[model samples]
Target: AMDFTDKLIISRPLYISDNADPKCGYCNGKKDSSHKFASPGWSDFYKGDEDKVELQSSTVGFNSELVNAETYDKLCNLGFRRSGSFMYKTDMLRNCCRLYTIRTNEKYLTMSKELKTSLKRFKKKITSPEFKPQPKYVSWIDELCDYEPKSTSFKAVFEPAEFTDEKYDLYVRYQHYIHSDEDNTPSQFESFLCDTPFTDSEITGTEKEWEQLNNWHNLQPGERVTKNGPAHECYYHNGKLIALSVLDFLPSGVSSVYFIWDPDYYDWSLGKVSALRELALVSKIGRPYYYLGYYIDDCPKMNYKAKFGGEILDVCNQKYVPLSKIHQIIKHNELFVGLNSTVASPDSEILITSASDKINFDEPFINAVDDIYGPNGNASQNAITSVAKLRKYGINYSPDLQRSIYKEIPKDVYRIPNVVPGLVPLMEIVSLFESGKMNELNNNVVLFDTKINALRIVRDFISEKPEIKTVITDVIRLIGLDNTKKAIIII
Candidate 1:
């Protein structure tokens, strides 16, 4: 028999890459570490054939090296995420892969100069015993997983007027659709839909497309957000007791989970409509931004998000920065992701990593940006710029050029005031932009800047006159761009 070292424990070639090994610590790259597993004992068992440590009925235990507090802290700080106490990526005892519940900083705000100064001092005192640390929510694993789906066994019912117990039962069943099981992976892309699982009567696409739509991984949110939330609290658009959303509200503030609609609603562009409707709810509830799940650069299915009116924002320095200038930035930097990292080029692994300490999806953002910009190139910019140039060339070459004035929407900054002049408050927004206050950076910083510009335009318009501060908040609220009513109000 081959020695344990001679055999492979990873299920597949890409297994180790997808699921990082705490023991290995990327030895192929980093050299200061040499342990093969976080827990050497478990590494031995995992390496051994038929080691026969009986599997725990629940994901209780078997083996895996325990990480010291320092090691644990290092992982979190270095962007290796965690869930409860268990490392988000590793652990032999746990049968199921863990989801990351890292808290992100509100991206639309600027750190107060005082806070920034104090943080610098705190960083200096890191080795001093006088420094106090807060408990990161990593160890709360059992509590995180305890919430059960309200009804995993319900069926779909889409009849417009149906209000039977069966419909209620179907509502219960819709809860199960929000999570991926043990074997989920990314699928070919398409924009998500809002049709309920209760009925197949939705205006939609082919059976194959529907099946891809139904793939649980594509539909689920990260871990507990989907599994633990109250069954009915996951809101839906119900018409006469019929649920419109098959799997609604997976609960990640950055992005909520949703499914795709059938072809019947294709002409109406209902997917974008439903997304806007949900975003309105998010705004009303005071959550600043709504995630349309993901906007994949390489994958064709994920392209639809670009159609939404606002620009793509990147998170940086605990703030959301808009990618409106991606065309400009791309002239130099090849890859950029949620405010944290800018890869100079595709072939370069070296990243311009930002040192912001807010809840930001740094890892995923960088990975996504690199995929689009480095290995190939930015499709978003190339597509638009090429189109603009072709039109310009045609205009210049055309015999009718003298008769017609050639025009173009320049690739530069965009502002809401440009679209709706009187609708925004200008000065207050400028103050905020200058002061830099916003929340949640996991998405991008442009949201903050965008809100700042709009608010400035609105404020400048109003401040010149009197008697408007009384309803300023209300007016700003109507704009729905600068939402300052959440856990930490930026204004």
Candidate 2:
């Protein structure tokens, strides 16, 4: 039998919206157009006035094309993440906000006193006998029933990410009460929670994991085998939904996507309860990490994730440093690489810089992507149908190119990590391009069925087509020296 598989990676500089800028979800900052292909600009304002936080979301994205659990774990390390099937990373060097890809293990988790207080309060309520779907109109007998011992019970189970009337009801109630949204239709709910881009065949644990929880008295966390897939953790007051956490269990860890709780349980502090429970769940599943996505200091809504106390991914270096050690440096600016360490991690090779190598870093040029938004909704802004018009402000954006270049280099434009902070340093993909250090037995890195011996490829690239010198260098910066050596880039 022949195997059916196709995999390719492309950079999409042409995929961004020219005018459809977004409002800063963090502060009371007004929406602004992205400083597309220009310098980072922010205008300071005086006290007592809300200053404009004009920054566009910059990212280098790739089509996920059927990824597995372990590969996703590696991608997570490089600050890549899932928005459905699309995997992308914020261009930390140039994007408006520095969205740090944050993760923590049960080993490193530390709960805040506020969170601890919520946990303690919940513990009391759970230990006591509570009504099964507590009577909607509370009566004297109902109040007195709580005083009795062993009179009530609750249920918590991990359900497959499927739809049901009960779950939908709770979803609507949660959205209405918490978010004040009345028009959250069923389809909208399903797409956000029920839909997944991962391989469905891999969803093994969810099939029977709930069966194990039925015997909560003897559900041994240590005895559980590792299982990976999308799931929902539901807490109930015996047939009544109290809270639900949208989660993804992977080989490395579990990532909590979204959590919703009944508004009546406001005093219960369901958010803290849900997070802490997943921390325990992953620990029981024998996984080390619990990935809390995108922790930022500037945003109050997401800032609370910091108390979980894990490591932040240093995207430039492809390493995880303790969060506490890096936040002081992070809060100071929207950009962070590392301490600009001059040494490499794997081979201890001396790293080079743009200034030292006389390398110029700028945006990758690709043809405009139309119909992205829709027929009329997704049309390109400012009638920028071509690269020349896209960068028309400076008519001389590219002196060499007279027309569209997507045909020459395929449909991608990888955003480079030139000025951003990172751990591994640059070497123009030739000098630090060592072999034995990255993978096994001098086997050359393979791409397009050809060995990626940078010595030959770069030699030919610059020698034959000198114009692609900056292009190859930009790709080198996108996937650093160590990663570049280990992988192959399709020409």
Candidate 3:
């Protein structure tokens, strides 16, 4: 498999929003900023009954236009899960509840008895006398039109356009029909099902063009219809919509987002059937992996995901291990499935941090800066000037401070601070300087002399490391010119 790390670029900055509602899906605590993915109390999603203390969980949000298979593959490896236009890596380092990113090679999936039976029944159901399979829409020149017909076991066809009222109604009904006990709404449906950033052109083609071609398949009855293109698959029986599968066609495979069906077919095990059907589709396309979102071992609702038989991402190693082994480990109670799991911990691998902790500077840089700016310095004025500039770029200063400090701070010496590993901070600093936004560095130094020396060290480092600087410059340009709103840093 191709490595995606080099291809992956953040089109946007990682954003940490204000705390979510106390009773929101990720956290249950009443206080804002209750979750911790850092020092002090790490977030524990599976917190036993510790009632008084607040639970901590926050999404590390960023947006990126996944341009190719490599980017998507790498993003998945990095533990990113997409929602609509944005993508997020959970605060797994500080999370209490662990969500394992799961996937499978579509070609190797072995059908289970239940899945086999479901597929058999699904075909029979669609082929019944009452059910009639017909093209849902036809394009007549500039006009787009919909059609309704009946079929028994009619296979679903994909469409790239927005959901029709009929489809949305079926979705709403499916939600209420299945989970009458839980709260659900059209807005939720929109967010969960219809909010994808992928448009028709991204999937198939322009609406008029796609329908125009599809109309040919609809022109004659009992004639074989060719696939117009990849789309969201909707299955109806006897002219009544029954199921909707929201899928994203990836370069390497398909991402199954959400699949819902009419409550009447609940016992028919349509979920497995959908998985099988999607796998078949993947086979036809020659894609490798079928990404099935996070699989939680403890959640009964998520049990079906295990049957697909693929690899589970091991947080500790940042690698994939066979699902069979994961299951065995779980059975043996040896599954290290947390941010702090002693069996497999990712604490050392996590590079991102909250803005508040940016002041914790590198010890070597700290000692170096302090030595030059100390009262015993041989020629401290130069150091002061250099440190002053460098300090502004450090995270010790807030975004607001960057705005004011450039205007308020005189050409005086100051004291400093830090960073993503290796090239991230360097690239960002270079970007800021190239844009003539030196004040935007927002360094935390309180004294002008300290700030000047910090800048001096940074400048010397950049001067000496031309090769690394070249890489940083290239990364900056790639990030700057790209139309994709990819973030430079995820929260």
Please provide, for model 1 over 1-491, each residue's C-alpha lDDT reduced to its tens digit, 9 standing for 90 to 100.
21221111110000122222233222212211112222223233345432222221111111112222222222232222222222222211121121111222224223345433433342342223443434442221111121111212222232222223434444334433433232221111111222222112222334553443223222323322112111121222222222344222223332334433333323434344344434433333333444443333322344445344233433212233343334343222122333335433333111212223442543433334333322132322332333333232121111111110111123211111111111222322323323433222112211112334432213232222222222222223122232222111112
Error of 3 at 185 (Å): 5.2
The C-alpha local distance difference test score for the whole of candidate 3 amounts to 0.45
Q: What are the C-alpha RMSDs, in order, of all predicted structures? A: 28.7, 12.6, 14.7
- Candidate 2 stretches greater than 4 Å from native: 1-21, 28-54, 63-65, 129-152, 178-183, 204-206, 209-224, 340-491
In candidate 3, stretches whose alpha carbon ends up further than 4 angstroms from where it belongs are 1-53, 63-73, 106-108, 128-153, 178-188, 203-230, 315-317, 328-393, 396-491
Q: For each predicted model, how many residue pairs clash, with residues at least 3 apart or on different chains?
A: 74, 12, 54
- Displacement of residue 317 (Cα, Å) in model 3 is 4.4
Using all chains and alpha carbons, the TM-scores for the candidates as numbered come to 0.26, 0.63, 0.55
Choose the strongest candidate by lDDT: 2
Please provide, for model 2 over 167-227, each residue's C-alpha lDDT reduced to its tens digit, 9 standing for 90 to 100: 8888999988865476588877776787665555544445455566333333344665445
Candidates' C-alpha lDDT: 0.27, 0.51, 0.45
lDDT of 3 by residue, 1-491 (tens): 32222233333334242223443343332332232222111223223423433344444545543334345545566566667556665443223334568888643477667766776675555454554434542321111111122232454666763557777777777767654435556666665566454423455566565454334323433333233223567776656778888876666567777887888878777888778766655554445778888875545566578887787775433456666654643431122332322222221222221112222211111112112112232222332233345444332222122311001113101111111111123334434555754332122101112323422212332332333333223233223222122222211
TM-score of 1: 0.26
lDDT, model 2? 0.51
Higher-TM-score candidate of 1 and 2: 2
